[PDB]
Amino acid sequence: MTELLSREEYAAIAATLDLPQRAFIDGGFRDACGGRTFASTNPATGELLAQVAACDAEDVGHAVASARRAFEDGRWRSRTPAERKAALLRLAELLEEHLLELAVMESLDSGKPIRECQHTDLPETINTLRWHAELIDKIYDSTAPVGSAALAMVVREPIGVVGLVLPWNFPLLMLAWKIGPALAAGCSVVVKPAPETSLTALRVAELASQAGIPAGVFNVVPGGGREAGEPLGRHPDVAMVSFTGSTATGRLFLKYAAESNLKRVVLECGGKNPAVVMNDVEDLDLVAQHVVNGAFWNMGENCSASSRLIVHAEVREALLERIGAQLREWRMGDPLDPRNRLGALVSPAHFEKVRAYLDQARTERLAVRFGGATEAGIFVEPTVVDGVSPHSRLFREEIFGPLLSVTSFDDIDEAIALANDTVYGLAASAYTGSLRHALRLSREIRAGIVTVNCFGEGDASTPFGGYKESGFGGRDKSVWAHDQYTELKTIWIDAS
Amino acid sequence: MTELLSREEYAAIAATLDLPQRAFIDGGFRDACGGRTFASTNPATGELLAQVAACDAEDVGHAVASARRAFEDGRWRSRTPAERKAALLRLAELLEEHLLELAVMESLDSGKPIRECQHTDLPETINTLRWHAELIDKIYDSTAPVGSAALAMVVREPIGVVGLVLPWNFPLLMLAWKIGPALAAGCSVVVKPAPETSLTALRVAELASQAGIPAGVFNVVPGGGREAGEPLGRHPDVAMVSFTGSTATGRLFLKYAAESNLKRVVLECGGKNPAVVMNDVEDLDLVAQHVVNGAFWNMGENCSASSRLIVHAEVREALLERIGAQLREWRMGDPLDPRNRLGALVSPAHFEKVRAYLDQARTERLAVRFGGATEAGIFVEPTVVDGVSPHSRLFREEIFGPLLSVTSFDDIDEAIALANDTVYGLAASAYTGSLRHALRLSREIRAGIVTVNCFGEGDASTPFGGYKESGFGGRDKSVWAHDQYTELKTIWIDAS
Amino acid sequence: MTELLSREEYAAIAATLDLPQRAFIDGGFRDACGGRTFASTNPATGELLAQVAACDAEDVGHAVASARRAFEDGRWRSRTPAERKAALLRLAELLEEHLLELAVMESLDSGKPIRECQHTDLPETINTLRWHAELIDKIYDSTAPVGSAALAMVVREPIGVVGLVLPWNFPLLMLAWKIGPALAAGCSVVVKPAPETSLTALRVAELASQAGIPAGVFNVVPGGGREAGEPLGRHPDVAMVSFTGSTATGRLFLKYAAESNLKRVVLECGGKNPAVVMNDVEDLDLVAQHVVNGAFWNMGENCSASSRLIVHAEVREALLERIGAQLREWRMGDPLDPRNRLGALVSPAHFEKVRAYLDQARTERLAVRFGGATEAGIFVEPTVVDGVSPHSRLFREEIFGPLLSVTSFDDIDEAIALANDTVYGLAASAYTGSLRHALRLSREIRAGIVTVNCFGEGDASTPFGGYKESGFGGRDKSVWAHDQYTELKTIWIDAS
Amino acid sequence: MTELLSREEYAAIAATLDLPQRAFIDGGFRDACGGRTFASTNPATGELLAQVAACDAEDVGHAVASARRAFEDGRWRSRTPAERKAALLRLAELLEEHLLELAVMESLDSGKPIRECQHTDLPETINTLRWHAELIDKIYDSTAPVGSAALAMVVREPIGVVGLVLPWNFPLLMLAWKIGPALAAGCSVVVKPAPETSLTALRVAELASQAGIPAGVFNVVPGGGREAGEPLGRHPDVAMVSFTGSTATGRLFLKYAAESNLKRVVLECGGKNPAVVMNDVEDLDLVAQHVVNGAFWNMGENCSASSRLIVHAEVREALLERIGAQLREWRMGDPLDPRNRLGALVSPAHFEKVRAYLDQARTERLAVRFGGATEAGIFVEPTVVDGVSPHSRLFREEIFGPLLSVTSFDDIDEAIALANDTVYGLAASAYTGSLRHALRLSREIRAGIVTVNCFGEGDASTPFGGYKESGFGGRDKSVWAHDQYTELKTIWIDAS
Ligand SMILES: NC(=O)C1=CN([C@@H]2O[C@H](COP(=O)(O)OP(=O)(O)OC[C@H]3O[C@@H](n4cnc5c(N)ncnc54)[C@H](O)[C@@H]3O)[C@@H](O)[C@H]2O)C=CC1
Ligand SMILES: [K+]
Ligand SMILES: [K+]
Ligand SMILES: [K+]
Ligand SMILES: [K+]
Ligand SMILES: [K+]
Ligand SMILES: [K+]
Ligand SMILES: [K+]
Ligand SMILES: [K+]
Ligand SMILES: [K+]
Ligand SMILES: [K+]
Ligand SMILES: [K+]
Ligand SMILES: [K+]
Known part of the structure; x- marks a missing residue:
């Protein structure tokens, strides 16, 4: 460094x-x-x-x-x-x-x-x-x-x-x-x-x-x-x-x-990339670290960004708590202040598109669990919206900003179905302690990369690109x- | 067999x-x-x-x-x-x-x-x-x-x-x-x-x-x-x-x-595939045999068909002569007659397109050196048209019939420029005894296959497909x- | 079939x-x-x-x-x-x-x-x-x-x-x-x-x-x-x-x-191939099915045979019980009787070499938990010997017969060390429900194949062969x- | 440079x-x-x-x-x-x-x-x-x-x-x-x-x-x-x-x-590497230039060195003539003198082995056409020995010094048989203008590299190594x- x-x-x-x-x-x-x-x-x-x-x-x-x-x-x-x-x-x-x-x-x-x-x-x-x-x-x-x-x-x-x-x-x-x-x-x-x-x-x-x-x-x-x-x-x-x-x-x-x-x-x-978190993860705080990074790195202006958190019902709340705590470490402001991990969105017009999905969340009466604020007409707070069903426009449409949707599931077959319920297929992340579950999630999610127990896009030697409309x-x-x-x-x- | x-x-x-x-x-x-x-x-x-x-x-x-x-x-x-x-x-x-x-x-x-x-x-x-x-x-x-x-x-x-x-x-x-x-x-x-x-x-x-x-x-x-x-x-x-x-x-x-x-x-x-014949070939009869097969296999209804013969001026006439001799072995007629290497074109509509190019040859006052006739509104003879310039419509357009244009060159740089004078690039063949010339024709003709000293499409293990608009x-x-x-x-x- | x-x-x-x-x-x-x-x-x-x-x-x-x-x-x-x-x-x-x-x-x-x-x-x-x-x-x-x-x-x-x-x-x-x-x-x-x-x-x-x-x-x-x-x-x-x-x-x-x-x-x-069984397996009877097959398929006359069962101390007994029950399904006798999964050893001389390790087990005062019998001077019963330390000759030497050694471990670092404590390196099997443990065992065991949650040698498309003296x-x-x-x-x- | x-x-x-x-x-x-x-x-x-x-x-x-x-x-x-x-x-x-x-x-x-x-x-x-x-x-x-x-x-x-x-x-x-x-x-x-x-x-x-x-x-x-x-x-x-x-x-x-x-x-x-020169080369001076470099680079202390010149009878003399001319550009002496392409052999012991082959040439009454002298007990001139039959010791044994044997052939089948007349198979070079001959020499010489119309060992991306006893x-x-x-x-x- x-x-x-x-x-x-x-x-x-x-x-x-x-x-x-x-x-x-x-x-x-x-x-x-x-x-x-x-x-x-x-x-x-x-x-x-x-x-x-x-x-x-x-x-x-x-x-x-x-x-x-x-x-x-x-x-x-x-x-x-x-x-x-x-x-x-x-x-x-x-x-x-x-x-x-x-x-x-x-x-x-x-x-x-x-x-x-x-x-x-x-x-x-x-x-x-x-x-x-x-x-x-x-x-x-x-x-x-x-x-x-x-x-x-x-x-x-x-x-x-x-x-x-x-x-x-x-x-x-x-x-x-x-x-x-x-x-x-x-x-x-x-x-x-x-x-x-x-x-x-x-x-x-x-x-x-x-x-x-x-x-x-x-x-x-x-x-x-x-x-x-x-x-x-x-x-x-x-x-x-x-x-x-x-x-x-x-x-x-x-x-x-x-x-x-x-x-x-x-x-x-x-893309509309999912992040699947099973109930058998060994370290929930480390998962939360990866979900926060996936959703909000580069202010969410990221083709590989985690935008659909698909989380097992028994760990949703415990995970949301650790996500809120991780967010305290994410300072946003003056892009030339080296203390900031978050800078400004690219343009007034893009800022308006992202903020329109903040409005859409409130129109759909969804719970905004974290974030929701704007600053200087160019900064959007990292935002986490709970209770997002597959019919929501926040579930289905690429926002390309710092906005994470949260959907619960009860078994891995529903998690995989949810993960694939998109016209996109660029990237995915999956979190689990189980060999059985990890093989299922990485083989059955239809995306050009699936990362397991971490978030990312691979490295210089791994190909990157989309299935379907990605x-x-x-x-x-x-x-x-x-x-x-x-x-x-x-x-x-x-x-x- | x-x-x-x-x-x-x-x-x-x-x-x-x-x-x-x-x-x-x-x-x-x-x-x-x-x-x-x-x-x-x-x-x-x-x-x-x-x-x-x-x-x-x-x-x-x-x-x-x-x-x-x-x-x-x-x-x-x-x-x-x-x-x-x-x-x-x-x-x-x-x-x-x-x-x-x-x-x-x-x-x-x-x-x-x-x-x-x-x-x-x-x-x-x-x-x-x-x-x-x-x-x-x-x-x-x-x-x-x-x-x-x-x-x-x-x-x-x-x-x-x-x-x-x-x-x-x-x-x-x-x-x-x-x-x-x-x-x-x-x-x-x-x-x-x-x-x-x-x-x-x-x-x-x-x-x-x-x-x-x-x-x-x-x-x-x-x-x-x-x-x-x-x-x-x-x-x-x-x-x-x-x-x-x-x-x-x-x-x-x-x-x-x-x-x-x-x-x-x-x-x-x-495609509009060329066949380049150098003046240093070891067996002009065998070249003729490959050029005839490349032009008239399947009545020229062939994406890989030789349709532009690009031949060195010193061997043009002696090649054409053996081509005529070869054409005497190619019987046309009743598709169920095992004696015929050439059957009927696929439809009256396609026969019309092919014949309009025979008429175009006459319109352009080009020397029809072999063939040129039709039978029964559905057969076309193997036709060789000499002195075709790159400006001719017979040089530039896919005919998809048994019609071979012939064009002369003086040096191999001109042969190469002629072979690539097309929006297509599916196949090409090249005949030469020279190691130096073979490597030069192999590398510089912009086509998905270049056969050297034979005509063909490769075999099961080799990829077939077009450059450019092919x-x-x-x-x-x-x-x-x-x-x-x-x-x-x-x-x-x-x-x- | x-x-x-x-x-x-x-x-x-x-x-x-x-x-x-x-x-x-x-x-x-x-x-x-x-x-x-x-x-x-x-x-x-x-x-x-x-x-x-x-x-x-x-x-x-x-x-x-x-x-x-x-x-x-x-x-x-x-x-x-x-x-x-x-x-x-x-x-x-x-x-x-x-x-x-x-x-x-x-x-x-x-x-x-x-x-x-x-x-x-x-x-x-x-x-x-x-x-x-x-x-x-x-x-x-x-x-x-x-x-x-x-x-x-x-x-x-x-x-x-x-x-x-x-x-x-x-x-x-x-x-x-x-x-x-x-x-x-x-x-x-x-x-x-x-x-x-x-x-x-x-x-x-x-x-x-x-x-x-x-x-x-x-x-x-x-x-x-x-x-x-x-x-x-x-x-x-x-x-x-x-x-x-x-x-x-x-x-x-x-x-x-x-x-x-x-x-x-x-x-x-x-080889002296290990079979590592972790305490986090999802189905112990299925493990036992794989261990029995690995140790006794072809009467143990198998280069890839499981000959060192390296088992976590908390599941050793439960595993040994299910192994004994699986063995009831393994009939041995007349090689032309289709009811037999076990036939005769190859020769009097090989029979004598295998039986010499039965004697060596008793010399070392080891517990013979299952098997131990011979028939007709050419059949050896599937035998399981408990309490085998790395200094035993049964731990270190290729027997090439139906004789399985059992060694306990307390943590995965000891299992891996035990698994590699050999001059051989032909094959290995590992059993675990954990992604973390499975990656460790398959990457750190020095053998030409490591199978995970099954026993075998791969298939027609996977290479087979030994590290070290295998x-x-x-x-x-x-x-x-x-x-x-x-x-x-x-x-x-x-x-x- | x-x-x-x-x-x-x-x-x-x-x-x-x-x-x-x-x-x-x-x-x-x-x-x-x-x-x-x-x-x-x-x-x-x-x-x-x-x-x-x-x-x-x-x-x-x-x-x-x-x-x-x-x-x-x-x-x-x-x-x-x-x-x-x-x-x-x-x-x-x-x-x-x-x-x-x-x-x-x-x-x-x-x-x-x-x-x-x-x-x-x-x-x-x-x-x-x-x-x-x-x-x-x-x-x-x-x-x-x-x-x-x-x-x-x-x-x-x-x-x-x-x-x-x-x-x-x-x-x-x-x-x-x-x-x-x-x-x-x-x-x-x-x-x-x-x-x-x-x-x-x-x-x-x-x-x-x-x-x-x-x-x-x-x-x-x-x-x-x-x-x-x-x-x-x-x-x-x-x-x-x-x-x-x-x-x-x-x-x-x-x-x-x-x-x-x-x-x-x-x-x-x-190795005992051959250099096959056909009678149809386009530039005998350039062949001579590659054959000299292949034989006398690093004083012939080279595993890939050309040591058997296998040349068509029609071009033997005209090649040897240009080889002599080329040898006039190869100065020998003080290794720290930048004018010299040839330095000292590695040791008195190796100089002895090399010189015993010069004596062996004279013993065999062979025509030493170029070089043949030594200086200061540690230098050997680039030496070309003509009329070497396959039965000669200079044809069969690795000399690892600046000594080139010369052998004539009449047809390419004899050239190939001569090139392979050895227990070795490290490298080989072959010179010809013919596509047909180039493919035949490339495929039939049993060596780990065959260079065509040049001498060399390939580059960083090509594998180097011997067939047979090489x-x-x-x-x-x-x-x-x-x-x-x-x-x-x-x-x-x-x-x-
Ligand atoms: N083709 C090639 O790459 C080379 C071939 N040679 C040929 O081999 C001949 C003999 O030259 P040498 O210097 O004796 O080469 P060598 O083959 O004996 O030496 C190669 C290496 O092996 C080592 N070595 C020698 N005897 C050994 C032994 N008994 N056990 C273990 N290592 C041993 C040497 O110290 C050296 O590092 C040369 O005159 C030449 O014909 C020599 C050098 C390179
Ligand atoms: K700007
Ligand atoms: K697509
Ligand atoms: K669209
Ligand atoms: K039809
Ligand atoms: K294209
Ligand atoms: K068009
Ligand atoms: K026998
Ligand atoms: K080895
Ligand atoms: K031994
Ligand atoms: K020294
Ligand atoms: K060998
Ligand atoms: K030897």
């Missing part, structure tokens, strides 16, 4: 930052063709941070063209895997050298607490880039068992220009989850970050040039959803799009592919992320 | 067949709810074969419901891999016992010649099922390198109810390419075959019941594209659709996914077909 | 058997060069069964020469994996057609009960051959991530002539465990079975010729250890030896390799058995 | 080195218990470098004991793969910072020329460690297809205390080839280096402590073959030995295993090196 600075010292670092403002295309910064900009404001203070280039289909066309040329060049693609690894490791170094700068910049643009930006987001981003850089020259393709008269290989090739559309809850980490495997594979990429959180991706693109990523191989095009993301998804020279965000918006990229060049689309979408066509992290950005080729050589 | 019968003998098998007519749903035959039928006719004669149930959204809803109930109660997927292998092997045994019956039925409904139905289609169908049956209890999933405090498995689970939408050109073989891996993975499957070629799929689904595939696990819903295919793609309980057919239609299934439950979609589509998201055959029908799950077990 | 016949009917099948008697070399039977024979007698009756060729280094030389020629030929090796699979599947069919004959013959030569020979040994043998036949055309080798200037494959090739030295406790199953992977890989093999149990291997070799295994590819050379096994291990043209038997004898094959041609040696040796250099079953019989080759093709 | 210094500058680094002298055991330096030493001298001058501790069975016992205690308490192996990777990367960083120091030290002790020590040995050593560090958290184990009633994992565990016995020809590189994979797998390692070349291993073990390799995990015990190597191979707590050296000595470690605890033994031994049981480099130091375990968890 790197040492945390003081509030004043972070403010001092903020004050000296030269925030990026222009798109990054073909090796350097440039304004949008139409010269428009949009406001990036610190959600916790209201202060304007920068006037960021507001790109449209014209800018996207230029960015894709510079990526297409670089791909056809071979300037990046033709380096050896060991060489591509070296350059991406250089990039990760530079991020590490600039860690405090990037951590403060991430916090300012997003509302995320500096404490977690420094200890989690930045180290996780640096480690994602290192892991995928190191992986590329460890990947073996195959030869097929075809006999002595032929030599058949089954190998992988970079798909081409790759569009990467990002959300705002983990700007840098999501950036690394995508560019890591995509760049290591030898693709050129065009990154359209969230307009709420565009600054750090722009800075990382500049650092990548310094590291020797050639011009045109890693471009960042900031702008709105319809204005910049749709032309990217529709572009006839983009070979593949990887998207993370809402299901509603991910569906559009399936249309964009269908109506353009049949580009491969991979979606990582939302994802489409792939997985982030692990060696399987490489599949997103490559085509399989059978080379069959007669030898008869 | 099984022994061919006489024309009269095949006619006698045909006269005794009890052709299936009804949807196969939940372990038995049934009529469409609305009582509608459509006329399946022998494309070589115009004679009615059967009035086949014309299923609609309601029948699709019943078929999916039975597939869903079978999936949920585990009657198939809870059997061990070894048990699922045994039942699939029973099925392939049954197809083998009914080989002649199935070959004649396949010919009658499709126009495909009995000779190839008996020696290629049925044995390849039987083998596809055996290989994928045999594969399932040889597949290992993973555990991830996460250290001593946790145990992390990365496993595959069956995705659920699977929709399988098939084309008319290889009815039985495409069926096996889909149900082989999908049933072996433990999915329930609802098959919507082409209306031109529905009889054999129905017969197989009946034999699968006999072999112990439980009720609801393998259903066949015959009917039209909009009437039965669309409701299947839109169905909220179908988890995945695998499609083989035109790019135009495959685009629709991406929209159906976007507009319903975000089901996984895998598309296998058309495919989306997957590969048929090989162990990679398994990925289409399964979800990855990380099971992360704390052990701290 | 195939239907069991009556005692009289098995006797009738025995009476009509034409027992093999000669070595099987280069496609057919032949006497030993020196014309000597040795007696094969039914251990349960004393009756002579056959005078079997008593081969020496001369016969071994001929067998290896016929295998060397076949390997150099390519007659087997050069068939495609799919073709080798077909022939080995034919062989498995023939065994199935002759199942009752082989089951009776196995029982007569070995003492093993006909009930288990019919229901277990023969089906397991047939399934081993089928699994490895099916596997061969599912195995992919690799290509290395070396960049664009070279094409590097990493492939596997058959090592050559392979010597297979077998024990007597599972003659057919061990035969299949070895020839399966070795033949599927394309090696020629020379099999030296145990002199106690040579008949069924000879019969299987004849059936393999009928199935189309070419002459010289699968030879069987019966004879003594020093007389026939040592020349095989020393032969300068044998490329690899796979051995199963005692550690003492396995050590010799390391010397034989060192003193001859450095052939690869793989050893599968004995094995050397490989694993039987699973895809990893293939490694035993192949060499890795890197083919590096410049392409610069 | 790092910048070479002047002869005087290297001499000045040499004059300042504080050479290690003591065994490295349990995290620090210590004397041998008996107080003995042996004289390590510069083979180019005769000057004493250091009196090095001369360890015996007692010191080996202490080193193993510290390695055992470290293994049992998990100080290294209980760290995560990612943590073990980080410390190994620290180590490789340290070697990089001391590159010049280590290169000069390597030259002094071995006679290897400083130029190759600086540009090949050290960078390859540094890279070996990085690759194997980077690999460990990319390795996935397996789960087996056993059905729904059980969960079966097939995992790898570290084998325990590992003995690593090294030769003198590539001291640092062989060290990395062994400790890279073995430390990454979590083993403790006891290294017994060659007495000629012990200094650099000692230095590295000290740097490994600095890098956070815990005490006892990486020990170095210098001393003689019988005195230190034998007790290591016989030690009852060493689980595995990996050996690289002569076949004669490697045979002894198989006996040591047999006569102690049945520890796993992996042997990498000598190896036993394993491969160095690549992911397969991991198998040497790990045990497979099936964890079968009932879930019925």
